């Protein structure tokens, strides 16, 4: 599945397999009828946004998140691009990456993804969410139930094609 | 385009350019009024799920498809992660990878993708599917017809923006 | 974000952050009610479709844009595949990279993307487009306003979850 990093609303960990929505630019478990943006994933073969949309790195970024380049001219007349230094950045500091921060989550946005399900979820039907757990509904397609629901677990697991 | 591997329902080859849907977790050619999940693609630059959701491999995976890591402690107290071997794994019996099996197909899920079209399909419009071949409809956007439909070809080709 | 290269209508340059649509298979700024396919992006990094649907290159492609491979056999019985050269390819022309051509644009299709906004755009709501600039509407989800709208600029910037 194809994924990006998002921060949780309360900074706490949302476990693998929960369906999430956005609230105030941050993720929380989705509730019924809310826009489901994706699922917390451990299988993402492609993850993105590890250094995206943060203006506290080594080089200065523009308002769109792009690196700002200076056009440098040499004495001969050769012109080349050089990134602008960020005054804030400390070359001798060890910054903590998103993968080591509990509030930052890999969210699968597209592809076949494992999802927590209740007892109502059926192969070949869609889903909605209650407390981040799939219930029978109209979003996406359930591919197969790989771990049947158990009363004593409180959930089962299905592969869902998320788009 | 961005793609994943899916298995065909009958275990036979679906040729490139056909629109596909899911039935019982496997792919077949899409028909009237069905959810079109994507297109068999030869142009995918990113392709995923080659070894996803394999619970009979060498390394143990959890119910969500993630690798289960042992927490290992050195004599000093230093801790690190180590994959857990699978008890149900048998190195004796044969295994051929998905990429080498005919039943496993690259399905483009997102991006500009070439699609088989009928005589009703028009640039700038959406498509539906009949026998996996695009017909004038409501899904996606036709970017350009690259091979016009002719009779006795039975199809033409268009680039479609699939999302 | 996940992005692909698209050619612009009339070879026009479209700056970062503008919402785009397709017209005759080429991109232009989106207007009210039009289908928004994505946003001009500087945050995509690695971008698909640099070679996709180029029937004017060094190797021959089939009608679906897939590379055509010839089956080669050696004297000693070994079989392998190799791309079929295009005999109508002239290496003397020195073809120019997609990135140095004004008409080719990186369009973010999926993920968290910075978008130009007007004064009506609100966190947690969707957007429509006027001259490629977001206005309050029904598409996507505004994650957060990172640069509030100002008179001095005539726009603000928000991170929008595009799917």
DSSP state at residue C32? T
Region of B88 on the Ramachandran plot (φ > 0 left; ψ -120 to 50 alpha; else beta)? alpha
Written as six digits, the tokens of C6 are 């698209």
- Phi then psi for residue A72, to 5 deg, are -95, 135
Q: Which residues of A touch C126 (CB under 8 A)?
A: none
Q: Rounded to an integer, what distance in angstroms lies between the CA atom of residue A125 and that of residue A135? A: 10
Question: Which overall architecture, per CATH, does domain B54-93 show?
Answer: Irregular (4.10)
Q: Using the beta-carbon criterion (under 8 Å), do C2 and A48 form an inter-chain contact?
A: yes
Subunits that touch chain C (at least 3 Cβ pairs < 8 angstroms)? Answer: A, B
Q: Where in chain C is the domain with CATH 2.40.300.10?
A: 1-53+94-163
Question: In the CATH scheme, what is the code of domain B1-53+94-163?
Answer: 2.40.300.10
Q: Where in chain A is the domain with CATH 4.10.80.40?
A: 54-93
Q: Using the beta-carbon criterion (under 8 Å), do B124 and C23 form an inter-chain contact?
A: yes
Count of helices and strands (H, E) across chain C: 0, 11
Q: Rounded to an integer, what distance in angstroms lies between the CA atom of residue A16 and that of residue A6? A: 14
> Hey, is A143 helix, strand or coil?
strand
- Phi then psi for residue C137, to 5 deg, are -170, -155
Give the other-Cβ count within 10 Å of C138's Cβ.
9
> Hey, is B147 helix, strand or coil?
strand
Q: What residues contact A30, with CB distance under 8 A and at least 6 apart?
A: A18, A19, A20, A21, A36, A129, A132
Strand partners, B82: B70
Answer whether C131's CB lies under 8 Å from C31's CB.
Answer: yes
Tell the residue number behind the tokens 């005999």, with chain if given. Answer: C87
Q: What residues contact C153, with CB distance under 8 A and at least 6 apart?
A: none
Least Cα distance to C145 among A36, A53, A49 occurs for A53
| Residue B78: C-alpha distances to residues A101, A122, B73 (Å) | 19, 45, 6
Q: Does B16 touch chain C (CB under 8 A)?
A: yes
Q: What residues contact B125, with CB distance under 8 A and at least 6 apart?
A: B136, B137, B141, B142
Q: Rounded to an integer, what distance in angstroms lies between the CA atom of residue C142 and that of residue C113? A: 10
Q: Which residues of A touch B37 (CB under 8 A)?
A: 141, 161, 163
Across chain A, which distance is largest between two alpha carbons, in Å? 76
Region of B122 on the Ramachandran plot (φ > 0 left; ψ -120 to 50 alpha; else beta)? beta
Q: Rounded to an integer, what distance in angstroms lies between the CA atom of residue B154 and that of residue B133? A: 10
Of the candidates C2, C6, C64, the beta carbon closest to that of B2 is on C2
Helices (H), C3-118: none
Across chain C, which distance is largest between two alpha carbons, in Å? 75
Of the candidates B16, B142, B143, the beta carbon closest to that of C64 is on B16
DSSP state at residue B9? T
Strands (E), A37-154: 38-40, 46-48, 69-73, 79-83, 104-117, 126-130, 133-137, 141-150
DSSP state at residue B120? T
Answer whether B39's CB lies under 8 Å from B17's CB.
Answer: yes
Of the candidates C17, C111, C141, the beta carbon closest to that of A48 is on C111
Beta strands A46-48 and A2-7 are: parallel
Tell the residue number behind the tokens 């959810």, with chain if given. Answer: B35
Q: Which residues of B touch C63 (CB under 8 A)?
A: 17, 114, 146-147, 157
Q: Chain A window 111-140: which residues touch B at a Cβ cutoff of 8 Å?
A: 111-112, 114, 123-124
Q: Which residues of C are part of the catalytic machinery?
A: 4
Strand partners, B162: B111
Polymer length of chain C = 163
Q: Which residues of B are part of the catalytic machinery?
A: 4
| Residue B149: C-alpha distances to residues A48, B31, B43, B118 (Å) | 40, 19, 21, 6
Q: 3-class secondary structure for A116-134? A: EECCCCCCCCEEEEECCEE
> Hey, is A72 helix, strand or coil?
strand
In angstroms, what is the resolution?
A: 1.8
């Amino acid at each position: 599945d194809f994924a990006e990093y998002f921060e949780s609303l309360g900074g706490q960990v949302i476990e693998t397999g929960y369906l999430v929505t956005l609230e105030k630019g941050k993720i929380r478990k989705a509730e019924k009828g809310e826009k489901i943006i994706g699922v917390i994933s451990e299988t993402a073969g492609f993850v993105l946004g590890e250094s995206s949309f943060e203006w506290q790195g080594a080089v200065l970024k523009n308002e769109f998140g792009g690196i700002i380049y200076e056009e440098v001219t040499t004495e001969d007349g050769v012109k080349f691009k050089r990134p602008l230094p960020n005054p804030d950045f400390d070359p001798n500091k060890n910054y903590i990456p998103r993968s080591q921060r509990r509030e930052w989550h890999v969210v699968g946005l597209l592809g076949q993804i494992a999802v927590r399900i209740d007892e109502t979820v059926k192969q070949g039907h869609s889903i909605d969410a209650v407390g981040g757990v799939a219930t029978d509904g109209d979003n996406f397609i359930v591919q197969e139930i790989t771990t049947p629901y158990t009363k004593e677990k409180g959930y089962g697991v299905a592969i869902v094609l998320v788009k």
